[PDB]
Each structure stands twice: as structure tokens, then as C-alpha cells.
Design a protein around this ligand. Structure first.
Ligand code: GDP
Ligand code: TVT
Length: 1084
């Protein structure tokens, strides 16, 4: 609670007047380039008044530094002002724009003023004007004194700061007597000490260093209170934490404010510094003459002329104007400091640039185009750009008064009539009349074509004789705070007219039209006509209604594909928008219209109501708009300036609205305090936990990845459109995780629909064999070690005899365990085979157990109730060196009597007669291996371990047909792990290859044509099968490995994946011929 008395006293002195020498003769050069921060203490007469140390900032006056200065005129500062008196009131006039800049930039700062050079001060001349001076700031004194011999009343700054504790208070608080805790002064001291060791040519530090040292010094600085502390320390004037996300300076921290200021000379003397945000951005070097450039069309009628009457050119105005107006994609440029001259041809050229030959002290901006049509488009674009600029960065100007210079009779001077009356004179009726002679008349289309909307293409022109809507409130739709969208016809159509309200400034209509009439796309609603007589808009009436009351009402039509269409077409719209420097800031689920609820359409969403879409270059925006609940975080704290990534957060919120199927918006339509509790961050639940939805675990991974606070950690709109354009994201259903230090190499589902999924997981990591039992809809991992050796294979048979079901296992020790699927305690162990257990598999129901010794082990389905038995004879169809681990079933006409398989490195088959009807060895390189699985759709696709190839032997000719290599197919994904540890088959579409390298391979069936390849989610694929789920078929389990900590995910894949990767690819192929057919018309 120590009183920390420190505040800046930036002595802002116009050039030449001696701004430096005054403080030189107060405390104790030639041209002080940039800011020069000295230091200065105070020991007042009353010793109880603590040290009032003041970080003096000694600014400069050369216009380049005028332009680079106005970002360091912060609050908590007692300014000054200096002006010579030998030049009399002229210096007062010259300092008047500077005082205006002061009162514009800083409002809570007193402004003393002082003269200089009392040796030649003719105060009787300018005294009257100086008294008449006191929009200005609160001038509090006038002490015109000498410069070198300080004999007048000086040191009054102390008596005007220490007594200004409450007379200069930051919102009634204490400035010079702020009882600040010890933590803040601790941080200040440690930074002031560490200022040395950090390099001197570019002193910067990382926030991680600050945290590490604060922990090393036990500063007791909490991470949730650290940014407020560093912000106060910044505003004190010892370091500069530029936390502006539009500048990306949120990480790098600065320790020497003295250094940041004296870089203007370093950069005008003619890395990673390349962000000079204060093509090229060196406005110091620009010449400041009136160049030798003459208009081609030099008359009083052939050229339009606009004007702008402004009190004071704001510090850093012309810089922003040129940096904006060097967008040249709508050109021999000759831009000096102020007046850019965008020449194209003798037909169209916009010559912006000031003019002060007005016989008056005011400052005049002017625009000039030759009065053909292209000139009118140019003028009606530059007016929009200048008005956006002046409405975003410099709100104080709107004082501003327009001026349109028309000419009644050619070959004479032009009169001056302003737009606040021309608006009415052109809204009542066209053909502006000449009061002197009524026979003389001029058109309002070659005087100011930004007032009749003639600066737009000729196709979008109203046809009011065919707009038959009555204003009757029966036809009503949304009311977006500016208009009210009715339902109407237009020459025969369904069109949603948007009549504007009683009084709306035409700037709004142009704010909407400049985005609706330039960039076309099949995801952005397309304007049909826009008049001016009632100031209306006509937009293509979206049939199926806005999204909000399709969420609240029609929850049945909302499938799990449509939820990825109305979240992909919107991402398309956002990508196109942000690709042309427009930002939207309004993407809420009341503003996504629909056109068709049939899933596989082509145009399903189209954004609308572009009420607040402003232009946003790399500089950014400074205002704060939107709507509570759907606003970006940094929009709330309106002080910071943001850019085109305060929109992707709105998209994340829309996505959380969609995934919840309208639970957040309906539970928050009661109290907007609930919807604004998370307006910054930190109050969003995990969706599946509460609202009862179904999982979607490649969206939940994105929904947090585009929701973070740090405006650089969020994706760019392209990157958040190239994650949804992948059929790997629509076709999962779940993703479970298993504990640490456990593997899985044996799986059996339960199609009997006890809980519709009661997946067992045989494992053998330890010596004893474990037997997990996972439930799907609840995720209960109730493992139980009930075996002595590894559990190689499991199998299930739901006995129809007495409606039973008894899961059966197998052991590496060669034992046949049996457990009741319903009775948790029945260990009806059967007769152990003569060797180990290799595989098992299920009319004629019988367990076709496979042993390591190469002998077929068969049982009886009815022999389950027994306790130890060898039901049917063993068929030793192999040797000790033949591992009989192959078993499978048949699919061709479901003829299970054609049950295939293969004994070791050899293929065989049999029937219910149990005789080998065919035995074909596979001795035909990799042939020194064994066999894993066979599958029969039309032939036998046979896999084998450590093989980048899978063979194809036919069941009718018994010969090789083709060799479908795997590593060859994977040769363009990135000595590879291109093995095939598993091989599952769909019903009648395509193969499903599972590669131990961590890649699903959706090989198709026709000849060899690949369809896609899945990657970057696992590290291996242990065992794959196909089961049922929730009374419905079509799921495809996959057991991914993570290997060193072993993690065995258990994914769930919909089996409609092939026709997905096809359908969605055809869809995206369709609408990208439209996205170029529509767009190419806008250039034409
Ligand atoms: N003749 C005269 N010259 C002065 C007086 N006070 C200051 N100067 C000159 O003004 C110069 C300082 O200008 P300066 O304040 O640095 O200009 P700035 O950098 O644009 O602010 C010094 O070189 C002095 O020679 C004065 O009372 N009489
Ligand atoms: C946002 N306003 C618009 N709304 C629509 N579609 C729409 C149709 N209905 C109903 C249910 C009445 C029907 N049929 N409701 C809505 C929101 N189309 C166009 C717009 C537009 F022009 F304002 F963008």
C-alpha cells in the first residue's frame, strides 16, 4: 500500500519552438530525432510529499514524427505545450491542430501551456488570441517565460501535479498517491534490474521468462492476475506491453521504451522489426510538395468533384488513408505524402489529396473523377473507403461536413451545396433545379452518384412497377435492428424485400450494398435489386426458413449429415468473405438461412443480413459490435483492436449450438447474463455430458481448437474449412480411451443386443490372462484376470436352444475356457486340446477352434452345458510347423458349407462332410511366412504377416490373378511399416485393409482403384471386425495402438465410408464450378 508517485509529463512541443531547451534549463541539441525519454525526480517543500518522479517524454515536431507519434500519447499523463512568441499568434494557429490532437487522443489529461523566448516576446500581439482560444482541451494555465535564463515562475509542474491527486484522478482514484501493494513494486524493481542483461540492440523478452523469474523470485504473481499487473505497469510508463491482437505482439514483451521510440531514424536512414505497424510502410520518406501533375479533363463540367471539410487533420490520418487506398484490385501511381493519384487511363483516375487554398484556416480533402461511368464507380468506391476509415479509427471527426461542387452553367466557377440537404433534394425527386433559370437543370447522376445508387452495375436496378407487396404486417420475418424483411413477389418469384426503418443513414444501406453487390458465391445470399425511393433491398427468399426455428422446432429433420452441411457451407461463405478483406462479426444461429432439407443437395446454407460487415485490412478494426453471447472474446473489452480471427470464434459458437441441437440458445433465451457469462471464455461445458446428444469426436477436437483465448492459436478460415472437407470427420460415431499399461489383441462383440454393445477385450499383457468387459453407452472398464496364460482368441455363440449365450475363450497354454454371458460365475472349462489355441469362429452351429499344432478342433453347439468334452473328432490337417490361425466364414450366397480357411502356409476348405474338398499350397519371396485371414467375396484375398503385398487366389481356377501392393499405394503419403496386420471385408462395396503403420486403407473392389487413405490418428491397427450397435447395423471397430506409453484407443467407424468419400467429393466438385461461374460474372 505504498504511494507510488510516477506519471508521464510528455512535453509535446511543435518543432523549432524550443521544446527541449526549456526542460534543459528546467532540470539542470540540434534536432531531437523521435521521442527522447529522460528521467526527472521531485522533492517538494513539504517533505511528507513523497518523491514525484516523472518520466518526461520530449517529443519532436518534424512531420514524419508527427505521423509516427500518436500511439504513445496514453492516459495518466500531465501534458504541456510550447510555442514561440516572436512569430506571435501564427505559432498559436500552428499549435491549434496539435491541441485538437491532444483533446482527441487523451481526454482525462490536463494540458498546461507555456510560451518561450521572453527576450523577443511581443505578448501584446498574441495575448488577445491566446485569451480567445479557450474541441480544445481544458487549458489550465499560461506562463509565457524565457528559455535559457529561468527567472520566471518555474517548477510549477510540481505544484500542479502533487496537488492534482484528486484534481487529476483516473476515475476518482489516486494517481500520485496510489497505495499500490508490494507485489507491483517488486515486479517493477526486478524488471528495472533485468533491463541490463537483455541485449541492447533489440531488447525483448518472452512471457515464459517473466513467469520463470517471478517464480524464481517468489513474486507471488498469480497467472490470473499477472496480465492486469503488467497492464498497470505498462500504463505507468516503464514498459510497453502491446497486447493488441491485430499486431500479434501478445507474446513478445518489451523492457526498454527508450528503444522502441528511436527506431524511426534507423528505418528512414536510407529481423523477425518487419512488423512496423506504426506494401511498404515508411511514410517518413514521402515528399511533401504539390507534384507536377495536371488533369487530362480540365474544365468545369466534364469532371465530378467531391469535398470534405475537416477541422484538424488527425495525427496519423494520411498514413492510414494511403495504406488503405493502396488496394489496387477493384495503375501508374504517383503518391506523395498526402495526395495519391491513382491513374489508369485518360478515362478513369481518382486524384485524392488535400487543398488549403480556401482563403480560410480550414483543411479541405477533395476527390476528382472524370464524369463518365467508370469514374462514378471509382468515386463511389473511394467515398465508401474513406468513410469506413474515418468511422473506425478516428470517430472524433463524426464536426465533419460534406460538400458537393456542382455547376449550373458550364465554363464558370462552381457553387457549393452540402449533402445533408442534397439527400432530401434527391430523395424527393430527381433533376435538381436551377433557381435562377428553371430551364437549366443538371442530373444527380453526374454531381454525386453516391446518393442515387448509380455506382452499382446496371443489372441490379429496381423495377418498382412489378413489386406488388403490401406493407401489411401479416407478411413478417426477422427484424435485424435496422429493417424488417417481409415476403414479396418480384416480376413473378418469391423475394424477401427488406424495407429499411423510418430514418436510417444511407451509410448503412451502402455498408450492406458494398458487400452484397461485389462478391458473389453459392454460399452468400445474392441481391436481385436495390432501389432508393423507399430505400429498400430485395433478396432471394430462402424457402426453408432461418436456422434458429429449425433447431427449436424441427429436431427430427436434423440428421448427422445435415449438421455437417450447415457447418460446411457456412465455412465456405466465411472463407470467401475473409479472402476479400471483409469481416462479418455477426455469425449467430439466427443468421444462417436454409434452402433445402434433403441431405445431398448442393446449396443448403446462405448467410444473410450483412448489417455490420466492415472492411478489414491487415491493420484491423477498433470498434466493438455484435450481439451478447455470440461475440468474440476480445470484442467485449472494446479497447483492444482485432482482425479477421474474431470471427472464427463466432463459428465455434455456432458449431457448439449445432452440436447441442439447440440447448444452449434455448436455455439462455431466459437470462442474457447466462449467455454473457462465457462472453470471454471459461464457462462452456463438454457437450455429451448434459444435453444428451450423441458423440462426434472429430468435431469436439476442433470445437476446442477454435475456441481459445490467444488470437493466434485459433485456425485461419482456410484451415478451418480444410478440416471439414474430409469424410474422415462425418463418419465416426465414438472414440473411447483405455487405461495406461494395458494392450489389446483380441476382441468379440455381442450382436444379441443385451445392452446393444457389451464389447469384451481379451488381453495377455501380464503372464495371467485378463478378460475386460467394456460397455459402450456407459464406458465401464470392469476388467477381470481369470486366465493363467495369454488370451489369443475369443468367440461368441448365442445358442438358440433354450435361448442361451455363452462366450468362449482360448489360452496360449492350450485351454478351452467358457463363461456364461448372463451368469457371471460359470467357469465350465472344457477338454484342453493337445496344443495351444490359435483361433476360433462360429443350421449347423459348431465352434471351429484352431490350434497351433495344425489340427482342426471342432465342438458341438449343444455341448456348451457340459463340463469337459471333446464332442467331435479332431482333424489333424497339418504338421507341428503349420500354425492353424486363419479361420473365416463364407459370404457368397451365405453358403456356410463352403467355409474357407487355410492351414499354415497353405489354403484348404471343407463342408459339413468335413472332408478337404480342395487344398492349394501358397508356395508361390515373402513365402517364408504364415497366413492370417482369408475372405471370400468373389475370390480369396489372403493376407500374411510382415507383407507389403496381399495375394488374390480364386476359388474356381485356383491360380493367382493380381498382387495388390500396399506400400506401393502408400508410396505417396509422406523403411516403412506397410505390413497388413488385419484384413476385413465389407458386404458388397470394398476392402478394408488395416496396416500396422497406423493407416486404414479403404481399397476398392473394381480392379485396384484406391478411394482414399486414413492416417494421422493412430500408430497401428491390431484387430478389426464388424459388429452391430444400438439395434442398428453398420459399424466397423478398429483397435489403434499408441507406440513409450501404450494407449489402445477403440474407435467406431460407420461402414458407409466409401460412398461418403465419393458423394462428398462429387458435391464439393459440383459447387466449385458454380463458385467460379457466378464469380466470373462480377469481373465481366
Ligand atoms: N536564439 C535562441 N535560440 C534558442 C532559444 N531556445 C532554444 N533555442 C535553439 O533551439 C534549438 C532547440 O530546438 P529543438 O527544441 O530541439 O527543436 P525540436 O527537436 O523540433 O523540438 C537549440 O539548438 C537552440 O539553439 C532562445 O531562447 N533563443
Ligand atoms: C433473414 N431473412 C430472410 N429469411 C428468409 N427465409 C425465411 C422463410 N421463412 C418462412 C418460415 C416464413 C417461410 N417460408 N422464415 C424465414 C426466416 N429468406 C430470406 C431472408 C432475407 F432476405 F431477409 F435474407
Amino acid at each position: 500500500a505504498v504511494p507510488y508517485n510516477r506519471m508521464k509529463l510528455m512535453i509535446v512541443g511543435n518543432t523549432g519552438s524550443g521544446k527541449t531547451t526549456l526542460l534543459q534549463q528546467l532540470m539542470k541539441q540540434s534536432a531531437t530525432v523521435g521521442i527522447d525519454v529522460k528521467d526527472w525526480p521531485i522533492q517538494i517543500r513539504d517533505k511528507r510529499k513523497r518523491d514525484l518522479v516523472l518520466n518526461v517524454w520530449d517529443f519532436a515536431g518534424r512531420e514524419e514524427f508527427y505521423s509516427t507519434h500518436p500511439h504513445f500519447m496514453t492516459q495518466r499523463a500531465l501534458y504541456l505545450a510550447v510555442y514561440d512568441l516572436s512569430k506571435g499568434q501564427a505559432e498559436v494557429d500552428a499549435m491549434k491542430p496539435w491541441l485538437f490532437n491532444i483533446k482527441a487522443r487523451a481526454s482525462s489529461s490536463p494540458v498546461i501551456l507555456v510560451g518561450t523566448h521572453l527576450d523577443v516576446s511581443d505578448e501584446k500581439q498574441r495575448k488577445a488570441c491566446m485569451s480567445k482560444i479557450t474541441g480544445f482541451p481544458a487549458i489550465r494555465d499560461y506562463h509565457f517565460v524565457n528559455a535559457t535564463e529561468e527567472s520566471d515562475a518555474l517548477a510549477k509542474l510540481r505544484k500542479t501535479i502533487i496537488n492534482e491527486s484528486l484534481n487529476f484522478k483516473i476515475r476518482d482514484q489516486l494517481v500520485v498517491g496510489q497505495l499500490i501493494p508490494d507485489c507491483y513494486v517488486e515486479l517493477e524493481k526486478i524488471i528495472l534490474s533485468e533491463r541490463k542483461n537483455v541485449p541492447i540492440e533489440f531488447p525483448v523478452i518472452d512471457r515464459k521468462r517473466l513467469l520463470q523469474l517471478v517464480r524464481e523470485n517468489q513474486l507471488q504473481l498469480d497467472e490470473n492476475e499477472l496480465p492486469h499487473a503488467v497492464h498497470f505497469l505498462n500504463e505507468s510508463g516503464v514498459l510497453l506491453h502491446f497486447q493488441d491482437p491485430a499486431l500479434q505482439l501478445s507474446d513478445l514483451y518489451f523492457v526498454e521504451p527508450k528503444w522502441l521510440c528511436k527506431i524511426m531514424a534507423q528505418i528512414l536512414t536510407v529481423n523477425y522489426t518487419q512488423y512496423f505497424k506504426l506494401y511498404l510502410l515508411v511514410p517518413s520518406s514521402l515528399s511533401d510538395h504539390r507534384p507536377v501533375i495536371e488533369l487530362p479533363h480540365c474544365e468545369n463540367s466534364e469532371i465530378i468533384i467531391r469535398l470534405y471539410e475537416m477541422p484538424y487533420f488527425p495525427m496519423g490520418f494520411w498514413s492510414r488513408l494511403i495504406n488503405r487506398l493502396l488496394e489496387i484490385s477493384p495503375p501508374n501511381r504517383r503518391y506523395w505524402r498526402q495526395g495519391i493519384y491513382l491513374n489508369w487511363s485518360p478515362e478513369a483516375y481518382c486524384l485524392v489529396g488535400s487543398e488549403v487554398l480556401d482563403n480560410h484556416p480550414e483543411s479541405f480533402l477533395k476527390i476528382t473523377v472524370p464524369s463518365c461511368r467508370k469514374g462514378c464507380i471509382l468515386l463511389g468506391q473511394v467515398v465508401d473507403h474513406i468513410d469506413s476509415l474515418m468511422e473506425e479509427w478516428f470517430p472524433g471527426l463524426l464536426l465533419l461536413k460534406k460538400w458537393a461542387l456542382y455547376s449550373f452553367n458550364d465554363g464558370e466557377e462552381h457553387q457549393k451545396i452540402l449533402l445533408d440537404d442534397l439527400m432530401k433534394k434527391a430523395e424527393e425527386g430527381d433533376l435538381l433545379v436551377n433557381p435562377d433559370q428553371p430551364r437549366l437543370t443538371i442530373p444527380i447522376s453526374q454531381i454525386a452518384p453516391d446518393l442515387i445508387l448509380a455506382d452499382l452495375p446496371r443489372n441490379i436496378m429496381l423495377n418498382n412497377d412489378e413489386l406488388e407487396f403490401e406493407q401489411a404486417p401479416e407478411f413478417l420475418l426477422g427484424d435485424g435492428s435496422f429493417g424488417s424483411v417481409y415476403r414479396a413477389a418480384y416480376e413473378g418469384e418469391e423475394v424477401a424485400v427488406k424495407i429499411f426503418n423510418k430514418h436510417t443513414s444511407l451509410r448503412l444501406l451502402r455498408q450492406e450494398l458494398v458487400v452484397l453487390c461485389h462478391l458473389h458465391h453459392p454460399s452468400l445470399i445474392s441481391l436481385l435489386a436495390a432501389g432508393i425511393r423507399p430505400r429498400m433491398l430485395v433478396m432471394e427468399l430462402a424457402s426453408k426458413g432461418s436456422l434458429d426455428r429449425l433447431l427449436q422446432q424441427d429436431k427430427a429433420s436434423l440428421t448427422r449429415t445435415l449438421q455437417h452441411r450447415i457447418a460446411l457451407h457456412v465455412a465456405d461463405g466465411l472463407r470467401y468473405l475473409h479472402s476479400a478483406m471483409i469481416i462479418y462479426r455477426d455469425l449467430k444461429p439466427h443468421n444462417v438461412l436454409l434452402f433445402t432439407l434433403y441431405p445431398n443437395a448442393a446449396i443448403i446454407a446462405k448467410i444473410a443480413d450483412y448489417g455490420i460487415a466492415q472492411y478489414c485490412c491487415r491493420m484491423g478494426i477498433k470498434t466493438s459490435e455484435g450481439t451478447p453471447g455470440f461475440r468474440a472474446p476480445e470484442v467485449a473489452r472494446g479497447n483492444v483492436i482485432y482482425n479477421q480471427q474474431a470471427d472464427v470464434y463466432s463459428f465455434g459458437l455456432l458449431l457448439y449450438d449445432i452440436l447441442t441441437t439447440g440447448g444452449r440458445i434455448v436455455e439462455g433465451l431466459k437470462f442474457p447474463n447466462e449467455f454473457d457469462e462465457l462472453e470471454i471464455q471459461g464457462k462452456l461445458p463438454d457437450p455429451v455430458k448434459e444435453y444428451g446428444c450423441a458423440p462426434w469426436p472429430m468435431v469436439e477436437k476442433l470445437i476446442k481448437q477454435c475456441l481459445k483465448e490467444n488470437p493466434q492459436e485459433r485456425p485461419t478460415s482456410a484451415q478451418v474449412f480444410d478440416i471439414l472437407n474430409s469424410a474422415e470427420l462425418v463418419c465416426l460415431t465414438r472414440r473411447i480411451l483405455l487405461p495406461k499399461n494395458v494392450i489389446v489383441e483380441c476382441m468379440v462383440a455381442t450382436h444379441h443386443n443385451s445392452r446393444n454393445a457389451s464389447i469384451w477385450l481379451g488381453c495377455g499383457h501380464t503372464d495371467r490372462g485378463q478378460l475386460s468387459f467394456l460397455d459402450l453407452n456407459t464406458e465401464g472398464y470392469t476388467s477381470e484376470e481369470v486366465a493363467d496364460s495369454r488370451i489369443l482368441c475369443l468367440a461368441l455363440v448365442h445358442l438358440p436352444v433354450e435361448k442361451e449365450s455363452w462366450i468362449v475363450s482360448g489360452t496360449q497354454s492350450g485351454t478351452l475356457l467358457v463363461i456364461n454371458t448372463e451368469d457371471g460365475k460359470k467357469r465350465h472349462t472344457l477338454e484342453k486340446m493337445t496344443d495351444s489355441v490359435t483361433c476360433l469362429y462360429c443350421q449347423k452351429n459348431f465352434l471351429l477352434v484352431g490350434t497351433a499344432d495344425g489340427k482342426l478342433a471342432i465342438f458341438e453347439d449343444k455341448t456348451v452345458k457340459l463340463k469337459g468334452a471333446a464332442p467331435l473328432k479332431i482333424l489333424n490337417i497339418g504338421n507341428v510347423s503349420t500354425p492353424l490361425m486363419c479361420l473365416s466364414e463364407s459370404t457368397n450366397s451365405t453358403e456356410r458349407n463352403v467355409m474357407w480357411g487355410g492351414c499354415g502356409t497353405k489354403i484348404f476348405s471343407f463342408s459339413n462332410d468335413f472332408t478337404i474338398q480342395k487344398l492349394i499350397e501358397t508356395r508361390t519371396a515373402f513365402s517364408d511366412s504364415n497366413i492370417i485371414t482369408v475372405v471370400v467375396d468373389t475370390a480369396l484375398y489372403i493376407a500374411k504377416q510382415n507383407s507389403p503385398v496381399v495375394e488374390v487366389w480364386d476359388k474356381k481356377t485356383e491360380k493367382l490373378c493380381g498382387l495388390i501392393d500396399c506400400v506401393h499405394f502408400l508410396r505417396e503419403v509422406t523403411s516403412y511399416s506397410g505390413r497388413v496386420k488385419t484384413l476385413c471385408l465389407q458386404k458388397n462395396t470394398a476392402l478394408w485393409i488395416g496396416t500396422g503403420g497406423g493407416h486404414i486403407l479403404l481399397l476398392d473392389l473394381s480392379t485396384r482403384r484406391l478411394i482414399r487413405v486414413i492416417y494421422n490418428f493412430c500408430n497401428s491397427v491390431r484387430v478389426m471386425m464388424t459388429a452391430q450397435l444400438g439395434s442398428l447395423k453398420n459399424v466397423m471397430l478398429v483397435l489403434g495402438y499408441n507406440r513409450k506409453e501404450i494407449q489402445s484407443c477403440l474407435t467406431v467407424w460407420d461402414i458407409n465410408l466409401p460412398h461418403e468419400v465419393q458423394n462428398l467429393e462429387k458435391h464439393i466438385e459440383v459447387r466449385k464450378e458454380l463458385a467460379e461461374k457466378m464469380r466470373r460474372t462480377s469481373v465481366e
